[PDB]
């Protein structure tokens, strides 16, 4: 109605969040026995090299 | 050993070591081969003998 009561507004809204993160490891090792007497499996007579296994 | 008053002088040293044989090495009976694998191969070719006859 005119000249009487009035109307009012509401307010806004907020939110906040937090989070964590996981971890992912990966390891390996090389021993003498893996290249001691094993042929490279490539050329006919090339001995096994550590570099190839590393790659 | 009777104190530092008696300044001591030079002393000699001797040593003893176990006996070492040189007979076989002196005779030059052995040959040396350097390989790669832990196993060594031996190849013995055997010939054949015979006598020729007149024809």
Automatic annotation (TrEMBL), chain A:
Domain of life assignment: Viruses
Record protein name field: Putative major head protein
């Amino acid at each position: 109605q005119r000249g009487g009561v009035r109307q009012h507004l509401a307010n806004d809204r907020k939110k906040i969040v937090n989070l964590n993160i996981p971890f992912f490891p990966l390891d390996r090792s090389i021993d003498r026995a893996d290249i001691q007497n094993f042929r490279e499996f490539g050329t006919e007579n090339a001995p096994a090299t550590v570099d190839a296994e590393v790659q | 050993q009777n104190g530092d008053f008696q300044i001591l002088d030079y002393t000699g040293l001797i040593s003893t070591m176990p006996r070492v044989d040189t007979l076989l090495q002196s005779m030059n009976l052995f040959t040396e081969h350097f390989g790669r694998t832990t196993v060594a191969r031996i190849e013995r070719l055997d010939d054949g003998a015979g006598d020729i006859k007149a024809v």
